[PDB]
Amino acid sequence: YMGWWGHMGSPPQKGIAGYTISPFAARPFAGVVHAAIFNTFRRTKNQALFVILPVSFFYYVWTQASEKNEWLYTKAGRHELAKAL
Amino acid sequence: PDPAIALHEAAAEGPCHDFKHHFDECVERVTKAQEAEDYDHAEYKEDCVEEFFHLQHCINDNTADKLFRVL
Amino acid sequence: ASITSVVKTSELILKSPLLSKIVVPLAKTYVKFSGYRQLGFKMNDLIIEETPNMQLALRRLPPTESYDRVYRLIRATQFSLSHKLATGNDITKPEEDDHYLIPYILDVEAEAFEKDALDNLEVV
Amino acid sequence: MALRKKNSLLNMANSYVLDSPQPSNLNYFWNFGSLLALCLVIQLATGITLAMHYTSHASLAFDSVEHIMRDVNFGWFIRYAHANTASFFFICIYAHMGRNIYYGSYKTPRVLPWSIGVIIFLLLIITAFMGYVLVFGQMSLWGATVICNLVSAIPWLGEDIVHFLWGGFSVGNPTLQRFFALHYLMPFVLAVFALLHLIALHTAGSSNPLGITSNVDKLSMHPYYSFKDLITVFAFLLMFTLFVFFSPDKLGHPDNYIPANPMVTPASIVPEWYLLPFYAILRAIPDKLGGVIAMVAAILILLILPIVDRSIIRGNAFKPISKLLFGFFICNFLLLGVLGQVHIEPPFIVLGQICTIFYFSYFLILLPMVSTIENIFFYIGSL
Amino acid sequence: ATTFYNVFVKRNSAFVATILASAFVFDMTFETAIDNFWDRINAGKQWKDIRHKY
Amino acid sequence: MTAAEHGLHPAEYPWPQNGMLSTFDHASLRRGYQVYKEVCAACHSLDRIAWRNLVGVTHTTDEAKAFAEELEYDDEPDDEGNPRKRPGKLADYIPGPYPNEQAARAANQGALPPDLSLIAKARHGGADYIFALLTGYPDEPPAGVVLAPGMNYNPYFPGGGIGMARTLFDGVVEYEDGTPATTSQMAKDVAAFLTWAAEPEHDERKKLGLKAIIVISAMLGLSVYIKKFKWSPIKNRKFIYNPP
Amino acid sequence: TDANRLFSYFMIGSFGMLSAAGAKATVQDFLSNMSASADVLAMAKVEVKLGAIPLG
């Protein structure tokens, strides 16, 4: 499923003209400030839910479990611990 | 004299007064409970370790930096 | 899964009035959030191609459809590496999202599956 | 014809590091492969050097590690580099595996590199476990004891196998000396399998974040990915530096600075952090043999991803529901890790069982269901 | 700029020689600079600072 | 587990060596050696430290040779093969108070005082744990605590009952540099000294780390420029498509 | 312009220079592990008596 240079396995290409300029002719950091602020904001905003929802859920689960465990091993939690074992 | 003696006393009377009271109340109860007979044949003997820990943790938070500053 | 499977199950849903009433709106939202149209792809450009059946279906595309698919893949690759999205006419509009490949792959698979069945015939 | 293509030896190197045709749109998650190669080279260099100063005999092992720390020039650095790089190796391997799962790198036609990959992961676990025993501190001994006793669960012959592994009736000198020999060997085996999975990959080439063919648009590996790899090499070296020079013991257990004592048992015997999720899975099953099977299955089940993923599309970039499911799967894997090092107490016992069920149900139920439904939504949604 | 390019950069042999010579200079000067800076931020604490008492 | 079973967690004290760019205070290290020698060394060994290790850290070559030469070490047998002793040399390790574990336990009501050469790395907390433990013996155990015989209450020690009694009291040592030897001061100095004993490369390591951080950061910056430079023709590529 | 090219080679050259200096430091510190360790260097300077040694 992959060939090599000259016969890579692409369907025939026709009609596309491609253009680019030398690395010495270009500013490598052109538009960096706009990218760093606005592009990163767009990309992050669009993926935020997929990180926030599972992280926040599993952190809540952990927080509740760790707080209960801590409470069960206090004086106040003696009776509830006795039942739990 | 040990600078810590005064710093710890100050922190107990001051920012850690609520914790100091709880420890004090606990000790009063436990000593009284030990005084009562048939304490040795009780199921649950209370200690004051928890309250002590809460107090010491508090004193240490208010003292650590101050103590090392004078050594 | 086979394209045949996907197409048949989808047709069962589209037949049932109840089912279509609840599934079609969900599927349209799914496609909007999927966001492949924002890289100028058509849905069929995403189908896995490294399979004998799919390679055969792609070889049967008319030359025009084939040349345009090559351009959309190259253009989407350039958006991907640049971390940009399509704008303007590069965004695939819903009416341009045509199933250009589905008929070819369904024919390739029809023969492939008939061959499998007929390899297992038992004279009665 | 250029020499790099004409000469058969040069041409092999050329095919992998220079003319190798790569997709033009690999993102930074395609850099973990070269970081893993870097970790492997650091571990070989530091490991062989520690072997020049280490003594595998149980009467001398722990002290030979102190001699390395105290007397050997730069011994502290070589030791801490080796110990911390073991953790970095697992961070990079989890990132590389997570990349592979998110982007569908296990799908045809890349089943074979993925399957050899699963074996690489098992060899890394064994390598790291044996190397940790070599210190012969308290965690070394007690971790070897409890992990090697899991083999006792094998029916009929299990006890005999354990005595055979230990070379005696408990973990002692024979076990330490054999772990040294095998710990030296296993990284060479691991390097061979790493090479095999790359040769297997070379038939399809790298996948890419869009999940489509890259045969339409290839870039040479050099100079583009050579220079892009340098960025993450230096980012890795900065993290390495912060641990090795400024916090060399953050990732370790203080008990491993106490010499092994078969009499005294440490407060809590836990594996190194990177093995913790598998330990939580084992605790979840009450049966000994059940637990061992589950723990092994948790790794071997990776082999069925090519089958249970029913999607007609490769990877998650365009699949919102799959992306949510993947997020929950990853976070659950981290919670299992945390539960591997808590005490066996309420309410963590039940929570560990629920997280174990979720771990397995991803492969067996959720991914097959979600991938089926998404196929239908793509079709109906784009009509 | 042309002159500088022509002498130090154009020939790779010259470029590599310049890089290696600069690396040598950097290494020696950076060593001395860090040593002095380290001694200033940790003044009064190191053995060299208390050695004179003994 | 209960908090008592864990032990109270020590405060984070501001040690001079805390700080990416901070060495130990060597005057504190020297004072801490004197506390070790006059108090701890009665029960605790420091077996991983040789006399040469003190030199140019806490003491001059001559001071350390003087300490070594006051002791007797086992020599090679004489010509009739009889045992002999020799005076200590800088290569010798600091000798421990007891000949074996059994003797150590017999002198300490069954408890075995650990060797202190790695103690700062072998306990969670490090210097803070040592300082907290040494200074954290309350006059009276919290009401309700039952100590086993030969145990002392200390909340920092897991379970609360430690076989080591309080040993640092104001003026048990007379420091040679005129520092007031209070309980707190002695605990701070000996905790610093023991931290040095556990990690004697500490000062060199952090300075080498500073050099590495600077070089690696500059290389990271330059690697970003170079990658962007090399990739710009790919990032900047444009297409015109005319469908055939 | 030559100035334009020279700037990019200054970046490449600096990077090559720090990589050379970093490699040298790495190699030197690392390989020094093979030179005599501190405990070996502590075993020189043998002192020998002469009173016991007879003539001939």
Ligand code: HEC
């Ligand atoms: C005469 C006896 C004695 C003296 C003096 C003494 N110790 Fe100990 N120490 C012990 C014994 C016994 C233990 C074991 C306690 C136990 O494990 O219950 C111990 C334990 C310790 C521990 C370990 C506690 C733990 O976490 O396991 C440290 C640290 C310690 N000592 C430091 C010191 C320092 C620092 C000094 C003095 C400056 C000191 N000791 C003086 C007898 C002594």
Ligand code: HEM
């Ligand atoms: C994948 C490669 C490797 C990994 C993941 C690895 C992992 C480990 C680990 C986790 C330890 C315990 C470290 C500690 O806490 O002190 C260790 C110790 C050791 N390893 Fe390796 N190792 C690898 C390769 C090698 C190689 C190739 C050698 C060659 C002999 C080696 C020799 C040693 C030695 C001698 C020790 C004991 C000394 C010490 O603890 O530092 N290792 N290794």
Ligand code: HEM
């Ligand atoms: C020593 C450990 C390993 C090393 C050195 C290593 C190295 C690499 C390298 C260099 C690549 C090509 C570049 C890249 O995609 O990042 C790669 C690709 C891959 N690796 Fe690994 N790998 C290792 C372990 C693993 C493991 C444990 C797995 C699977 C469980 C795995 C599965 C793969 C797959 C499927 C690919 C192809 C991904 C794609 O390009 O789409 N590897 N590996």
Ligand SMILES: CCCCCCCCCCCCO[C@@H]1O[C@H](CO)[C@@H](O[C@H]2O[C@H](CO)[C@@H](O)[C@H](O)[C@H]2O)[C@H](O)[C@H]1O
């Ligand atoms: C990554 C570590 C660097 C070292 C490289 C790994 C060493 C082992 C590599 C050899 C294994 C054989 O690997 C095989 O080599 C041949 C030629 O070299 C390659 O052959 C490929 O390149 C050559 C020209 O470059 C073409 O003739 C051919 O059409 C193409 O398939 C295969 O794609 C590769 O699979």
Ligand SMILES: CCCCCCCCCCCCO[C@@H]1O[C@H](CO)[C@@H](O[C@H]2O[C@H](CO)[C@@H](O)[C@H](O)[C@H]2O)[C@H](O)[C@H]1O
């Ligand atoms: C590719 C290999 C080619 C052959 C290269 C041969 C390399 C082997 C030579 C080892 C040389 C070690 O040389 C010796 O190194 C150490 C650092 O390691 C230096 O030591 C100097 O810096 C180190 C930190 O880097 C400090 O701990 C030390 O107090 C200071 O004196 C010595 O000043 C130097 O004399």
